[PDB]
Symmetry: D2
Subunit: 115 residues, 4 copies
Amino acid sequence: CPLMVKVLDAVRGSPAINVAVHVFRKAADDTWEPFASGKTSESGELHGLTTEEQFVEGIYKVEIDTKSYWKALGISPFHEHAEVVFTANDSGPRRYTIAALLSPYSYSTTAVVTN
Amino acid sequence: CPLMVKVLDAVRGSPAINVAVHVFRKAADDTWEPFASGKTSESGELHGLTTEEQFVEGIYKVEIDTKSYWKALGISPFHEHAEVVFTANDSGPRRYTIAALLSPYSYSTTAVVT
Amino acid sequence: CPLMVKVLDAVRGSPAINVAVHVFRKAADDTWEPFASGKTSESGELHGLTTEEQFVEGIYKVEIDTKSYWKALGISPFHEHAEVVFTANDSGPRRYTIAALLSPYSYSTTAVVT
Amino acid sequence: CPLMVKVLDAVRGSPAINVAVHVFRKAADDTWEPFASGKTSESGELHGLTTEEQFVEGIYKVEIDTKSYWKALGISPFHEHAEVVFTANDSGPRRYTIAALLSPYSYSTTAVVTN
Ligand SMILES: O=C(O)Cc1ccccc1Nc1c(Cl)cccc1Cl
């Protein structure tokens, strides 16, 4: 499990559950091709998105559907979604934990990269 | 000045100066067309990106070239850039302030709509 | 105006208005003595807390009454208040801007020293 | 384990290791009495600070010695430390995860409260 996503809710002080996450990889033609997708669990985490074999060097985009999350709670959010774009494994395989803290008009995202 | 961008540096505790910012608007064909661009000033701010006449309802993407900013400081950042995608509602006098706080492996962004 | 405080609301995407702010300075006996206080304005800012003459080197604590702010909006917050403790160095012309972004169960604070 | 602290480093994209944490409880005389202390592990986490029996209702202060952390890395930080003050268990026992993301001139803290 080289790619993990964790989403927290800053309004309720709880994990953000059932948040849709889509991952894309930049193709040779500068196009974003679907790579993997899923929804966060009860712990606000999403595991098993890919494997070390499939997760090759490249530029990846992790899109977190924050808008749908907030609407389901009756709150009108600012962002359409949260996007995290990064180059991965360019110097060998690494483990990536992408964390996002969500608020209706703000979000913070950090990466924890393990070797 | 309905749209303003402010970028701060969390490592040095200062405005993020000369950060390239590109704004795009989603076109009818779901394509991002260039809308405006510029670089943050000494105060880490970018004003005059557009006018109220030109800034119509739609989905906009504010792209902040964070990578180039960090590389210039000798720090290898994590993100390729920071992106803020939102819908400009246009329902009453509204000024949009997009703020971003930058760290090498993290960034936070908030919108101040007044 | 060497010390300024800015408070934003991450839930409503607006400045945090009328937030009580208390500033303390650590005394010789390791006690926090009141230094200045006020409430954020409509722009979520608090200016004129002190002067360069009065703002000498020392350890300061900026306390933001976040609890009262959230309760007034009908939201039960997590924190009793937000505290920012720092050392004013006083080594060259320096203006201190203490910014805080508030959410019911979270807050972020950054210092912009220019 | 009703009280957990997790600290991340936003500059290096890694857990903040060996960060000293001191917890205090407000006494009857409005004084902060030492409650527990420890240092974050390799995963940037601090467990076993207290037990459900000892962690009674009250106002607690979690102090994270961020200054010492940054100085050890050769960076001059802004804050003397990060403090998180909250009322705990006022409506029954809860599990509290106090998370902090650190940068030299900024820090963010969130609480995840479980029942
Ligand atoms: O915008 C963000 O998310 C970064 C951040 C973090 C903590 C405290 C304040 C801020 N942002 C900020 C600042 Cl530094 C100035 C003016 C307006 C805003 Cl929204």
